[PDB]
Design a protein around this nucleic acid. Structure first.
Lengths: 150, 126, 149, 171, 139, 52
RNA sequence: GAGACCGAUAGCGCACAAGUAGAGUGAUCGAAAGAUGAAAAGCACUUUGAAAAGAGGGUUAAAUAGCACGUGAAAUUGUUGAAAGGGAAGCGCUUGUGACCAGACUUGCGCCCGGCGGAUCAUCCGGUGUUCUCACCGGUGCACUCCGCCGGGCUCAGGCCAG
RNA sequence: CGGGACCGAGGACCGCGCUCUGCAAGGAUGCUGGCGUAAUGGUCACCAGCGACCCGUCUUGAAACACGGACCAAGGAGUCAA
RNA sequence: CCCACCCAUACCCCGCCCUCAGGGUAGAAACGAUGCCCUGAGGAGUAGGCGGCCGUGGAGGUCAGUGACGAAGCCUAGGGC
């Protein structure tokens, strides 16, 4: 026998989505290829967030996107691996180019009316395959009733 | 026809795993059941007792599910089933299901002879 | 085994019986080996012992994996920044205890030896000076290396 | 109806059968085993001697705490009895089989009991009263008897082996 | 758009009506499936460009998918019957599989299937009589 | 009898599933994969004149 | 009128002369128990027995369905065959003996000759389809070319145990 | 420089090399014999050498005590709702 | 005190099974990518936790499934996985 005081640890992170969405499966295949064949850390982060669950993907509002568009970020492509929601407290939506998993109808309509562009992640892979000139945004993770009651 | 060339087939254990005390009680079937008594000698693995199945007895991945001729059994019910083995006569053999009638068996055997497919029970119902 | 000798064996990378390591003699190592004397036999290996151990049972730790030292290219990729590009360089560094002895010894996987041909002494778990096998047998470790290699 | 001995053909054999016969199965088994394999006339004479207490049936399996007699020495035992009722039932069956052989035209002077078998019939369920208001079974264990009477009646060698055999044949 | 061969594979990779699943392997009844194996490489009903070979009265019959008629099932198959020498059949099948880039990865499988069908169309040889062996069987 | 026999489904998810099934009904590979015999159908989706 | 219910130890206690038979002074308690066969065609006649029945002979597609009745498990029993047994058997590892078996093999492929039997040889022309350069169809081959068959010869690959 | 035992994983080429027409260099080939069937192999029964307490439950730290088990078939115990 | 010898599931080498880990694999001649290829390490287990599979009654779809030329069931010192 061998004396192993320490213990080899199995991985504690997701390697595949639990979702049976076939479009998400195709997106996972695409970003697996991209993260394997490119040196960009952006593709690895995007693939690992595509693995994640819904409580680990909180929504991002247009007010949050407009907040992060300030100070020289007006021309960067906004990348959100989550749902982009509308905020009616924000009366004036600036022009922006956002790629997301999905948009709400009001958020998509308000972006297109303000003159920006909405993209999917495969369109993001086509136009910025290495994630150049991109602003990666996450929503508030701890802003949940369960997390408040923890 | 003859099977594709393969590594020699090795069975790590030929004898079956018999249930404890199934040789002494007729109400106990000889099918394996893992002993769960905390004082059971077979569960505690004393020497001179029945062996317990484990994954270390597993067969080689290259020869698993191979009959001694080197083929893998494929259960067939009709001529359309046996024609699925057109491209695998050196890897899969055909085995006619038990509830297939004699005349349909003759049809399957004739088609399998044309396709060069081994039939495991070709002498049945003759 | 008590926790302190267990920890010292874990730090000396002696986790299995008949595992062997090369140690550079300082006070900080000699005191550890003196503590774990009831479980180990140690001594001063010669050039023949070093070269035969490295040639027959030499394994390098590459990306956490145990790779046999069958080519000089493995030694070049994993020790070439210290000037060790061949197995003769590795043997020289281990034998002469050079400036990169720590890197060479830690690159060497702990040697998994067999039981000795001819056996141990009749009572194995006494000190060497009492007629046993434990402790420092000095230059007599070479015969044990021949028997267990 | 099917007999247990299916190998025996019915062209030159004679069969007899009795079912649900209220006679002791154990005694009947012992009597049948005593007369198993005998001549028909010898079996009939022996069963009459059993009825007249001149020859005894050896008790071999069903014999626990039975008596001992001098008439077991013919069989090499000490425990033997005289099951008169079993002998009467078997005499009736043997006479029926002899009549069947006469109807078929066989010679009864050369017939042997090739097959004889006693099986347990469904039990007769009487009851008996015990102490303290208890009722126990008082059953009978009857038997089915059947019997049938019949007329009494260098390859793949090696080359070295072949050469040795030819040399020894020539020499 | 919303439909691709990749998506059809993702939908029907776990179950479809052509699937035959057993302990020793998974097979497919699909007509455009060379080697009758369940995989994306061989799923002819899934793939946009695909080939299939069936026996004829004499020779082989090869069907190929037409990419411009995917929504028209009655006119989606390009069918040629080869009833000629086996070498010419192999040459034509390999030409329509590899020369214009129409699934050059299926060339070996297509030639193999044509060869198997043409060998199956040969007359069969009579089997030798069974030799009785042992003790009970010989006597 | 007060076992739960009926399942409440969101109408939006019902309409989503109906749209997905109608979208899958216009894919000729999926029709063959569901065991339908459509090899002689001139076009999928099959539209017949209302005069007939 | 129905059922993603139960299928005769289930489902109501009850699928049957069931709130019956039966028990209790009484209030009350309360079962067990369905299936021959399509059709009784439910065995004429002879023979043996006092009879029950048995044997022949019949009916039936089948009595290996005989009002003990579809199928007919196990416990347990009888016969026959084989075996073991000096105060327990049973079980594990590994040989041997005896009995009984599943496979595997039987020849294939490729050449060189000779003999047959046919021109779905190469090229060109026209039509058609296609992946738009690849094919099929109709004419053209006039037998040193193609395709099968039959005899030989040669090489290779072929089963088991071994040196 | 001999003598012996056990093993032959992989499956076009690629690499490190060497004694460089080639090789013992990133894993066995070559030659030959008998047999081609119960001969090898397998199952069953038995003898032989060695090994081997009767299960479940309970108890405490554990044993022991104690409890249940003549045998077989069918039935038989973490369900539903809020 | 000395020499040789015996053998544990311990130690060394080799094969195989599983688990874990680290790599590779698309202008796809391209794959049950839920696949395949390469490499290394590890393997006892009560209470307890988790995963994958086998089996039974019934429901939808599918296999243009099997079947009076014999379904289901049952017996089997007959075989295969």
């Amino acid at each position: 026998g061998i004396d192993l005081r320490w213990k080899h640890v199995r991985s504690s992170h997701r390697k595949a989505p639990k979702s049976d969405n076939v479009y998400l499966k195709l997106l996972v295949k695409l970003y697996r290829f991209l993260a394997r064949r490119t040196e960009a850390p952006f593709n690895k982060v995007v693939l690992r967030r595509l693995f994640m669950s819904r409580i680990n993907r909180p929504p991002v509002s247009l007010s949050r996107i407009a907040r992060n568009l300030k100070n020289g970020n007006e021309k960067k492509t906004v990348v959100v691996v989550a749902t982009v929601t509308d905020d009616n407290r924000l009366l004036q939506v600036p022009k922006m180019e956002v790629a997301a998993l999905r948009f709400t109808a009001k958020a998509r309509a308000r972006i297109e009316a303000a003159g920006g562009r909405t993209l999917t992640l495969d369109q993001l892979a086509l136009e910025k395959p290495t994630g150049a000139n991109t602003l990666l945004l996450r929503g508030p993770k701890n802003a949940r009733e369960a997390v408040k009651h923890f | 026809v003859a099977a594709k060339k393969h590594v020699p087939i090795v069975k790590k254990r030929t004898k079956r795993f018999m249930r404890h005390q199934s040789d002494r009680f007729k109400c106990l079937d000889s099918a394996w059941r893992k002993p769960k008594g905390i004082d059971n000698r077979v569960r505690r693995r004393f020497k001179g007792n029945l062996a317990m199945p484990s994954i270390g007895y597993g067969s080689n991945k290259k020869t698993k599910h191979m009959m001694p001729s080197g083929h893998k059994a494929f259960l067939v019910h009709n001529v359309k089933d046996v024609e699925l083995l057109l491209m695998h006569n050196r890897t899969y053999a055909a085995e006619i299901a038990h509830n297939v009638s004699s005349r349909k068996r003759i049809d399957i055997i004739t088609r399998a002879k044309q396709l060069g497919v081994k039939v495991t029970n070709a002498k049945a119902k003759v | 085994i008590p926790p302190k000798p267990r920890k010292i064996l874990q730090l000396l990378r002696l986790r299995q019986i008949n595992n062997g390591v090369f140690v550079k003699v300082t006070k900080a190592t000699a005191e550890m080996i003196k503590i774990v004397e009831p479980w180990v036999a140690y001594g001063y290996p010669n050039l023949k012992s070093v070269r035969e151990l490295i040639y027959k049972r030499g394994y390098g730790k590459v990306n956490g994996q145990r790779i046999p030292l069958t080519d000089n290219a493995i030694i070049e990729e994993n020790l070439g920044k210290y000037g060790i590009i061949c197995i003769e360089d590795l043997i020289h560094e281990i034998f002469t205890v050079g400036p990169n002895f720590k890197q060479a010894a830690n690159f060497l996987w702990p040697f998994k030896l067999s039981n000795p041909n001819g056996g141990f002494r009749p009572r194995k778990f006494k000190h060497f000076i009492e007629g046993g096998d434990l402790g420092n047998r000095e230059e007599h470790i070479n015969a044990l290396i021949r028997a267990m290699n | 109806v099917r007999y247990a001995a299916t190998e025996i053909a019915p062209t030159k054999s004679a069969r007899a059968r009795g079912s649900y016969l209220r006679v002791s199965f154990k005694n009947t088994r012992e009597t049948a085993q005593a007369i198993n394999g005998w001549k028909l006339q010898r079996a009939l004479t022996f069963l009459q001697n059993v009825i007249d207490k001149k020859e005894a049936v050896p008790m071999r399996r069903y014999a626990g705490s039975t008596g001992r007699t001098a008439q077991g020495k013919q069989w090499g035992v000490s425990r033997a009895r005289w099951p008169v009722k079993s002998a009467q039932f078997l005499i009736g069956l043997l006479k029926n089989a002899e009549a069947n052989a006469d109807a078929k035209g066989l010679d009864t002077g050369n017939l042997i009991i090739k097959h004889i078998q006693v099986n347990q019939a469904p039990k007769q369920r009487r009851r008996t009263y015990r102490a303290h208001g208890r009722i126990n079974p008082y059953m009978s264990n009857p038997c089915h008897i059947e019997l049938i009477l019949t007329e009494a009646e260098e390859s793949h060698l090696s080359s070295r082996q072949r050469g040795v055999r030819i040399r020894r044949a020539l020499t | 758009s919303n439909v691709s061969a990749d998506l059809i594979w993702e939908v029907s990779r776990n179950y479809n009506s052509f699937l035959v699943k057993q302990r020793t392997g998974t097979f497919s009844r699909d007509a455009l499936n060379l080697t009758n194996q369940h995989s994306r490489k061989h799923a002819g009903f899934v793939n946009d460009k695909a080939l299939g070979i069936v026996p004829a009265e004499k020779g082989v019959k090869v069907i190929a998918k037409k990419v411009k008629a995917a929504n028209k099932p009655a006119s989606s198959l390009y069918t040629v019957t080869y009833k000629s020498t086996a070498r010419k059949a192999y040459k034509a099948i390999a030409s329509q599989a590899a020369k214009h880039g129409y699934r050059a990865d299926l060339r070996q499988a297509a030639v193999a299937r044509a060869s198997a069908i043409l060998r199956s169309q040969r007359p069969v040889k009579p089997e030798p009589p069974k030799k009785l062996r042992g003790a009970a069987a010989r006597r | 009898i007060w076992r739960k026999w009926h399942v409440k489904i969101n109408q939006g998810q019902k309409r989503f599933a109906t749209a997905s099934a109608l979208a899958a009904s216009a894919v000729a590979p999926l029709l063959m994969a569901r065991g339908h015999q459509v090899s002689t159908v001139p076009e999928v989706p099959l539209v017949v004149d209302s005069a007939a």
